[PDB]
Scaffold this active site. Structure first.
Site, PDB file in Angstrom:
ATOM      1  N   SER B  48       0.800  -1.222   0.000  1.00 37.64           N
ATOM      2  CA  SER B  48       0.000   0.000   0.000  1.00 37.64           C
ATOM      3  C   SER B  48       0.834   1.275   0.000  1.00 37.64           C
ATOM      4  O   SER B  48       0.304   2.326  -0.360  1.00 37.64           O
ATOM      5  CB  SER B  48      -0.954   0.006   1.195  1.00 37.64           C
ATOM      6  OG  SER B  48      -1.879  -1.078   1.133  1.00 37.64           O
ATOM      7  N   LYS B  51       0.696   3.445  -2.951  1.00 38.38           N
ATOM      8  CA  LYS B  51      -0.308   4.471  -3.167  1.00 38.38           C
ATOM      9  C   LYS B  51       0.319   5.852  -3.336  1.00 38.38           C
ATOM     10  O   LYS B  51      -0.280   6.721  -3.979  1.00 38.38           O
ATOM     11  CB  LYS B  51      -1.304   4.473  -2.024  1.00 38.38           C
ATOM     12  CG  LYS B  51      -2.236   3.280  -2.034  1.00 38.38           C
ATOM     13  CD  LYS B  51      -3.449   3.563  -1.158  1.00 38.38           C
ATOM     14  CE  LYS B  51      -4.495   2.454  -1.281  1.00 38.38           C
ATOM     15  NZ  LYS B  51      -4.128   1.183  -0.593  1.00 38.38           N
ATOM     16  N   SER B  96      -6.740   3.315   2.709  1.00 35.91           N
ATOM     17  CA  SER B  96      -5.875   2.404   1.977  1.00 35.91           C
ATOM     18  C   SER B  96      -6.700   1.509   1.054  1.00 35.91           C
ATOM     19  O   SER B  96      -6.513   0.291   0.984  1.00 35.91           O
ATOM     20  CB  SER B  96      -5.027   1.591   2.954  1.00 35.91           C
ATOM     21  OG  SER B  96      -3.768   1.272   2.401  1.00 35.91           O
ATOM     22  N   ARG B 224       3.828  -1.204  13.596  1.00 38.26           N
ATOM     23  CA  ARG B 224       4.554  -0.405  12.619  1.00 38.26           C
ATOM     24  C   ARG B 224       4.726   1.015  13.123  1.00 38.26           C
ATOM     25  O   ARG B 224       5.839   1.550  13.137  1.00 38.26           O
ATOM     26  CB  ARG B 224       3.824  -0.431  11.282  1.00 38.26           C
ATOM     27  CG  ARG B 224       3.592  -1.834  10.770  1.00 38.26           C
ATOM     28  CD  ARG B 224       2.714  -1.842   9.539  1.00 38.26           C
ATOM     29  NE  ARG B 224       1.323  -1.558   9.869  1.00 38.26           N
ATOM     30  CZ  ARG B 224       0.353  -1.437   8.969  1.00 38.26           C
ATOM     31  NH1 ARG B 224       0.600  -1.559   7.671  1.00 38.26           N
ATOM     32  NH2 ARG B 224      -0.895  -1.209   9.382  1.00 38.26           N
TER      33      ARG B 224
HETATM   34  C1  LIG Z   1      -1.784  -2.419   1.427  1.00 36.27           C
HETATM   35  O1  LIG Z   1      -0.684  -2.640   1.906  1.00 36.27           O
HETATM   36  N1  LIG Z   1      -2.931  -3.028   1.796  1.00 36.27           N
HETATM   37  C2  LIG Z   1      -4.246  -2.400   1.663  1.00 36.27           C
HETATM   38  C3  LIG Z   1      -4.827  -2.157   3.040  1.00 36.27           C
HETATM   39  N2  LIG Z   1      -3.979  -1.149   3.726  1.00 36.27           N
HETATM   40  O2  LIG Z   1      -3.862  -1.399   5.147  1.00 36.27           O
HETATM   41  S1  LIG Z   1      -2.494  -0.657   5.858  1.00 36.27           S
HETATM   42  O3  LIG Z   1      -1.465  -1.714   5.782  1.00 36.27           O
HETATM   43  O4  LIG Z   1      -2.894  -0.387   7.277  1.00 36.27           O
HETATM   44  O5  LIG Z   1      -2.074   0.386   4.903  1.00 36.27           O
HETATM   45  C4  LIG Z   1      -4.897  -3.473   3.805  1.00 36.27           C
HETATM   46  C5  LIG Z   1      -3.548  -4.194   3.838  1.00 36.27           C
HETATM   47  C6  LIG Z   1      -2.913  -4.339   2.456  1.00 36.27           C
HETATM   48  C7  LIG Z   1      -3.626  -5.428   1.657  1.00 36.27           C
HETATM   49  O6  LIG Z   1      -4.053  -5.223   0.524  1.00 36.27           O
HETATM   50  N3  LIG Z   1      -3.766  -6.592   2.304  1.00 36.27           N
HETATM   51  O7  LIG Z   1      -3.748  -7.809   1.591  1.00 36.27           O
HETATM   52  C8  LIG Z   1      -2.475  -8.012   0.950  1.00 36.27           C
HETATM   53  C9  LIG Z   1      -2.794  -8.249  -0.497  1.00 36.27           C
HETATM   54  N4  LIG Z   1      -3.636  -7.153  -1.043  1.00 36.27           N
HETATM   55 CL   LIG Z   2      -2.771  -0.297  -3.052  1.00 38.44          CL
END
Ligand SMILES: *C(=O)N1C[C@H](NOS(=O)(=O)O)CC[C@H]1C(=O)NOCCN
Ligand SMILES: [Cl-]
Ligand SMILES: *C(=O)N1C[C@H](NOS(=O)(=O)O)CC[C@H]1C(=O)NOCCN
Ligand SMILES: [Cl-]
Ligand SMILES: [Cl-]
Lengths: 239, 239
Positions: B48, B51, B96, B224
């Site tokens: 993420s 982004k 996110s 984190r």
């Molecule tokens: C990005 O890292 N993401 C999207 C969303 N953001 O949460 S954060 O880590 O608190 O920014 C959830 C976690 C992650 C995912 O998409 N989770 O699944 C991994 C494969 N998409």
């Molecule tokens: Cl993303």
């Protein structure tokens, strides 16, 4: 219905043995709310809240190149320790360093300052007095509802200055940010009246606010934000 | 003396039987610090945190017109409730919201995505895999020190996108603001590795930071920010 009075907010002034007005604007709903419809239209010296339009003008004329440009301390020791040091626009607004902005004003000049406020529709658009102090002790006056009408144009980049200028100033107005909301705001004190004007950003709406209160002494300046947050908390705008 | 190792920060990972790296960059002193020189330069899926460059490219190519353009929920119910609603750029980064950004990536397209990531000197600059998922399960990789370099370019508006695009994304990255500091940052998680990258703005300095850590389950995701903030407190960057 477009403007509503909520006198229950007066208890937030009453509990602190104070008097003033809070004006809220709900942007989504196009609705205003205040505890005192009359005082919400009373116009006062903007004092340090004038740093918002002052910043806009200095940026757009190129008196300030960007938010990092340093304006050195002039070596004059003043009553507010945070003023006796170099500043950029961001720290200049956070510590409300008047001498920085007085120099801004002198460089803008009378003609352009006056022309710009008219373009902004700002208050009574009167700059009589010293070009570098009229917003502290000259002719300019602005009400809380006028503040809101000006802040809303800034929010929407609708002021007659560059979008860049308007974004930098909203950056500099940044006061508070957490998972619940963002406040962009500026305080002011003219020796008799205290200001807090700005807005609260939420996920799907923005709430403009403008408040002033009688401030006989500097000791109660903290109340400006206290009373405003109590109102926002009563209206479930902030937790 | 450019980079220095501070193994004491390992106590902050040890305290939570976790493993990972915090990398800091003192902007004024042009000097970097980390608990793990090896891991600081090891490349991971950005997840993420991608982004940040995605937002920059979407804005600069016009896929995203401004921070208030709404991207309506496609109606697909997904596991994160905050994803099942309409978003603009601010809320899509705050929550996110991957489907929003996968649509960005689909509209950007492979050829322009590759050219821009190359222009940004971003990581291994390899977008192998699905155009709308390569940063989550594809061939793109980036190290914490590389994150710092990228973020420093964004801070200084030195990326090969417009000044406006860079300003909007730093606004979207706004995470925390108070009288002591501002954090602009982004989290990430790829199901094995957690990221937090960004910076801490002070009155007179900026501390860039990029951290990552082993994340066997999502239950420790708050570590984190917790472990990073422990380091920043230890170094007296924040109270
Ligand atoms: C990005 O890292 N993401 C999207 C969303 N953001 O949460 S954060 O880590 O608190 O920014 C959830 C976690 C992650 C995912 O998409 N989770 O699944 C991994 C494969 N998409
Ligand atoms: Cl993303
Ligand atoms: C502007 O209103 N200022 C500058 C500074 N701002 O403090 S604040 O009220 O927290 O924004 C101090 C007050 C004021 C002055 O310049 N003071 O001169 C006359 C008012 N005491
Ligand atoms: Cl002032
Ligand atoms: Cl901001």
């Amino acid at each position: 219905k477009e403007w509503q009075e909520n006198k229950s907010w007066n208890a937030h002034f009453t509990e602190h043995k104070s008097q003033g007005v809070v004006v809220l604007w709900n942007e989504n709903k196009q609705q205003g709310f205040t505890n005192n419809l009359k005082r919400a239209n009373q116009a006062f010296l903007p004092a340090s809240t004038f740093k918002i339009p002052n910043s806009l003008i200095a940026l757009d004329l190129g008196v300030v190149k960007d938010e990092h440009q340093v304006f050195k301390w002039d070596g004059q020791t003043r009553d507010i320790a945070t003023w006796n040091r170099d500043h950029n626009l961001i720290t200049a607004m956070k510590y409300s360093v008047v001498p920085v902005y007085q120099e801004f004003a002198r460089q803008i000049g009378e003609a352009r300052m006056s022309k710009m406020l008219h373009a902004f529709d700002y208050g009574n658009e009167d700059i009589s007095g010293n070009v570098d102090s009229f917003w502290l002790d000259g002719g300019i006056r602005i009400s809380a509802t006028e503040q809101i009408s000006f802040l809303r144009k800034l929010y929407h980049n609708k002021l007659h200055v560059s979008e860049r200028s308007q974004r930098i100033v909203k950056q500099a107005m940044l006061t508070e940010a957490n998972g619940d909301y963002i406040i962009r705001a500026k305080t002011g004190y003219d020796t008799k009246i205290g200001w807090w004007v700005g807005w609260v950003e939420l996920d799907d709406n923005v709430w403009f606010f403008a408040m002033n209160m009688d401030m006989p002494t500097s000791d109660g300046l903290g109340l400006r934000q206290a009373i405003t947050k109590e109102v926002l908390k009563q209206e479930k705008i902030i937790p």
